[PDB]
Symmetry: C2
Subunit: 306 residues, 2 copies
């Protein structure tokens, strides 16, 4: 209960909890998040779309900004082709239960007045504050190009443009997001989501790699990908399987196993589960077994309506 | 005649003379130079609106580009405001005897397509290669802004846009130009010009703060300005007066002179005068005089034509 808490839940931070308190009181409020069209939609996207839904059920008008432009320039399909990848992402998000408005930056991000403000913003954005923004995202070409410093003021003006009250994004975007706070006349509330550690235990669950779990993958694809997944003893920090637990599973969870090698349990909460894994009583295999079967029932409704 | 040698005249360099030649062969050849609307139009502009004329006389269809947008951005005027300023310059350049095509950057540099290529280009411009470009133009900025490194590519696509065969301009522009040459399908021929020094020897005569002889200056003002001008005997390098001698006076000119101070002289080459001034024969005073009077005769045609 408490719209505040529901939005707050599982977030990594809310730039000004105070400002959100106020936004909520408004009878008309908007929140926007951006997604570049992805071939496969993984738990990483789902984690966030899930958060968008939160704001959805709280009076917020959701806007899912589709970054097809970046794909255009960055040598990838043609816009028409991208539209097709992106309109699939819509079918998925709708599957997740996201009643939002979808836009393609490729319809406003080049228009006259937009470019103008962008340039305008460029006058008040230090080469440094900009670079450090993009620092969180990717590592930084051998020899960096001008486009890299432009990206952040592009994303900035994309928050300004709609005039929304809230911006959602993973923690990679806090720098850019903070630039927006300091540069736009309208300070926007930012809700950042934790990043999701890939299966092999490296970076994010980027589909630009192969350590992800698609919201559509078959019950087999899941069981497989999980049994391989990185998941040490006692260690919870960095543990992919443990995140999947903290952010997607419903409780009270009841994990099984022969009273010979353990004993069936019932972790009414996650902290509860975490503490076990820390105390060692819950072997990595039992966890995977539990998460797998569970994760499967959860992502089930989505695969279905697809 | 050899128009190549005509144009070659008073040019700090012609990036690819051979290419220039290949150009002169064509029937349809065009070139453009760029100017930011200015209140006072001093000899600075003159040195080049002249060269521009040489190329129009070789056949090159002239194109002037009043970068009213840059001017806008730098919190100067308000487009339509600036507009009238540039349109005044248009008149001054016309009162200088230049047939040409006049265009405002604000009318294209903000178009989807144009902006689109700026970004494509942004992926091809290293952060430094971009910075080292502006450095020759206007020093550096304590806390550089993305605007700085965006301008160069903003100028590159400015050569591309019309598809000019040659890009005229000052030497501060050399490094910007190379870029346009290294990043565009064709390799425009760049005829860079000397950079006229201010009457105090501190730099370029800048309409933007001080030292300069504005074309419409009255004989009397010209005399008062040329007199105060830094011009040390024997010193030719740096001396603005001498530059004015070199780039504007027709030879042979008869430097009027006190019978008892050496007596009237008649130089048939700038080299004589140089030789003279260097050897301390032509004292600065007699020099400043022969020059001021001579300028007043050349500018009058333009001055009164207004
Ligand atoms: K509360």
């Amino acid at each position: 209960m408490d719209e505040f808490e529901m939005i707050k839940r599982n977030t990594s931070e809310i730039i000004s909890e105070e400002e959100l308190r106020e936004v909520l009181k408004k009878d008309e409020k908007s929140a926007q998040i951006g997604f570049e069209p992805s071939g496969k939609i993984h738990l990483g996207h789902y984690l966030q779309i899930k958060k968008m839904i939160d704001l959805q059920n709280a009076g917020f008008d959701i806007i899912i900004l589709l970054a097809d432009l970046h794909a255009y320039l960055n040598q990838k399909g043609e816009l028409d082709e991208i539209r097709k990848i992106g309109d699939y992402n819509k079918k998925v998000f709708e599957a997740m239960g996201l009643k939002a408005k979808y836009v393609y930056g490729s319809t406003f991000q080049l228009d006259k007045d937009y470019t103008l403000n962008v340039y305008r913003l460029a006058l008040k954005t230090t080469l440094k504050r900009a670079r450090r923004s993009m620092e969180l995202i990717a590592r930084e070409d051998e020899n960096p190009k001008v486009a890299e410093v432009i990206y952040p003021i592009m994303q900035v003006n994309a928050i300004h443009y709609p005039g929304v009250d809230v911006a959602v994004g993973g923690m990679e975007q806090r720098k850019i997001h903070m630039l927006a706070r300091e540069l736009l006349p309208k300070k926007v509330v930012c809700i950042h989501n934790p990043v999701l550690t890939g299966l092999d235990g490296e970076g994010k669950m980027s589909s630009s790699k192969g350590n992800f779990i698609a919201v559509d993958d078959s019950p087999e694809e899941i069981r497989a990908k999980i049994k391989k997944a990185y998941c040490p003893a006692g260690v919870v920090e960095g543990n992919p399987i443990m995140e999947i637990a903290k952010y997607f599973l419903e409780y009270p969870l009841t994990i099984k196993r022969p009273e010979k090698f353990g004993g069936d349990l019932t972790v009414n909460s996650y902290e509860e589960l975490e503490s076990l894994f820390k105390n060692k009583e819950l072997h990595p295999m039992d966890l995977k077994n539990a998460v797998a079967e569970e994760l499967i029932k959860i992502l089930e409704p989505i695969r279905k309506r697809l």
